[PDB]
Amino acid sequence: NQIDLNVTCRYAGVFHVEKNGRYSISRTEAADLCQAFNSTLPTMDQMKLALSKGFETCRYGFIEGNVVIPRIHPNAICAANHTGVYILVTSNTSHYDTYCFNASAPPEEDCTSVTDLPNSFDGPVTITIVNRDGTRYSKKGEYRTHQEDI
Numbered sequence: 001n002q003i004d005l006n007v008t009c010r011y012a013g014v015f016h017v018e019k020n021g022r023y024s025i026s027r028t029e030a031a032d033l034c035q036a037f038n039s040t041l042p043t044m045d046q047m048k049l050a051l052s053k054g055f056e057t058c059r060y061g062f063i064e065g066n067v068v069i070p071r072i073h074p075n076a077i078c079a080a081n082h083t084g085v086y087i088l089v090t091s092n093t094s095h096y097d098t099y100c101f102n103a104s105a106p107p108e109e110d111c112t113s114v115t116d117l118p119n120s121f122d123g124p125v126t127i128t129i130v131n132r133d134g135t136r137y138s139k140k141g142e143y144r145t146h147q148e149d150i
């Protein structure tokens with residue numbers, strides 16, 4: 001009973017979370033996950049500011065209202081060579097990664113590790129935060145509030 005949460009640097013408070021290294025988060029689980037990080041789904045405006053500070057990924061993830069990929073450099077295998085906040089238009093499927101926004105983060109790039117999940121609740125799951133540099137923080141708990149996600 002274990003969940004890995006792979007987390008990125010924050011840019012103007014915005015970061016990317018991948019559950020178990022594969023697209024596997026529903027829209028409801030995404031909201032609950034950000035809440036566990038004392039964060040919210042970013043607005044489009046928040047994501048555009050993050051992009052302007054250096055944020056890019058090669059992964060679809062939820063923001064408030066849409067599924068997006070922030071792109072700085074054009075890459076053929078990431079968002080079909082687009083730059084800017086690329087918006088997913090057509091998909092059959094419902095599960096992606098998520099973005100989250102923490103207002104208390106530094107205003108620009110913060111590439112320090114994440115070492116807590118401050119708003120997780122009591123539960124039986126071993127939840128491990130995995131940073132890109134390999135640094136890990138684990139705790140026993142839960143964050144999912146919708147039965148359909150568990």
Ligand SMILES: *[C]([O])C1(*)(*)N(*)(*)[C@](*)(*)C(*)(*)C2(*)(*)(*)=C(*)(*)C(*)(*)=C(*)(*)C(*)(*)=C12(*)(*)*
Pocket residue numbers: 006007008018021130131132133
């Ligand atoms: C990157 O960015 C992503 N994917 C792969 C794996 C991992 C880990 C940690 C953090 C992040 C990530």
